[PDB]
Write a protein that binds this ligand. Sequence first.
Ligand SMILES: *[C@@H]1O[C@H](CO)[C@@H](O)[C@H](O)[C@H]1NC(C)=O
Ligand SMILES: *[C@@H]1O[C@H](CO)[C@@H](O)[C@H](O)[C@H]1NC(C)=O
Ligand SMILES: [Ca+2]
Ligand SMILES: [Ca+2]
Lengths: 416, 83
Amino acid sequence: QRRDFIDIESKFALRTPEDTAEDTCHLIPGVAESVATCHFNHSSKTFMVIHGWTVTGMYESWVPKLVAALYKREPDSNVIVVDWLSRAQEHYPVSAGYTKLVGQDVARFINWMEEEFNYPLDNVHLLGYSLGAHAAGIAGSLTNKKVNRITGLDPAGPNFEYAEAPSRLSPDDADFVDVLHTFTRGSPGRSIGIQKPVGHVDIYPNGGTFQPGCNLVKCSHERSIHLFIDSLLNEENPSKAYRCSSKEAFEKGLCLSCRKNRCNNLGYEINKVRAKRSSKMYLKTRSQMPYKVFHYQVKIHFSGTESETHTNQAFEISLYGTVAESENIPFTLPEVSTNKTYSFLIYTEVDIGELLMLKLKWKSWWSSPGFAIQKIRVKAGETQKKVIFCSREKVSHLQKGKAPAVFVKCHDKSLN
Amino acid sequence: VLLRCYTCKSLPRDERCDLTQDCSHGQTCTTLIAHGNTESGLLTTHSTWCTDSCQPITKTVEGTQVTMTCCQSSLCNVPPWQS
Ligand SMILES: *[C@@H]1O[C@H](CO)[C@@H](O)[C@H](O)[C@H]1NC(C)=O
Ligand SMILES: *[C@@H]1O[C@H](CO)[C@@H](O)[C@H](O)[C@H]1NC(C)=O
Ligand SMILES: [Ca+2]
Ligand SMILES: [Ca+2]
């Protein structure tokens, strides 16, 4: 009965696959009749879209895109857009505080669904962007039983970074909490996106500080949405993220394993792996959709006769596979030295197939410096295989600004 | 039925592989042969190993003819010129 739901300000609109942009039909808490009018499928899963702050008090471009992607992937489901634009259009610390009440409004609506129609909370997936992520968190900590999943799409950082579990999005908020941190650039408490792990699985695309094609002032912040939209539209080819100690350890290709759940899928397809401690996970992406790239750890032992060291050196590696090829992939090495092994990450948009050939180029009074390399060890993340490339001749000579050293496949070991 | 396959990395045209290893169940013997020009001349190499996945192929990668060959017989991964 609507006498107890009167204090709820937030509106819950149920959009259809054929009406994504407008908030045409409204599920009114306390009015059980409305649920039927809007044609809510009681046999289907429910998605709830909780927007973030909006200085215009208007739905952004991404709302009908996220809605439409959810109806492309799951056309029988129920997609609700939680309207809190009146509270979201305010000064940031105000709108931020308003998460405490938007969360309650949602929890109260969800709880009413379970009470009035005996709707399972295990059928509810909440998706919040910026402030919306924390509203989802708060809502989840207030529902009668625990909601299925909560996706954190770049949760807002200021006033949340130092916030205790109840006042923000946290792992206790649902059965599964997956988070996408895409714009952590800044000091703790002063980054648009929250830096710390707040879920069961926390993904940091491109180390989550900023995003490819972004350095229109919310490119890196919004990208968490489009990565999820990518995941819904390309269900068969998700991007993989790998559990790493640090972004610095990732860029050295040291974490690229899938053993004991040390890798997962980015987006909808994510494996619901509740870990003891929050797992930070990294990956690289493209500048545009589809964002999946292929990750490789390249190990090179630079052998030679006399000791030499060369700082911040530039190289170009070329990968030749069965399917296709990606030539002139550039990379740089802090230091390169005689009889020393260096490991580094190399990524490519191209599905090259099974690796066959690999060409290494060193980019430039005196005769050019050079090393003699016999083997190159490659670990391919996606296919979980260890590939050895070895010089056609006894040793290949990699000399600065000269012809590239050629290496052909000599071994394969699938790690599983 | 398991296989003992030849396991030798990038060997020259006239060098027969000595090393052998009993493969993990489901693996197939393989041979990768390369034939192209080098700074030395026209060189032919042959690598062999146990492989979980094996698709036989022949592609000319930037001037070098690379040939993958698969076989479910023990000690069958021997180049066409050594058999
Ligand atoms: C509700 O969802 C199921 C899929 O889980 C579908 O088969 C069914 O047709 C839907 N019902 C309505 C009313 O469309
Ligand atoms: C590098 O190692 C080889 C043996 O693997 C050796 O002959 C050579 O002298 C070493 N070079 C240096 C600079 O130590
Ligand atoms: Ca919480
Ligand atoms: Ca070319």
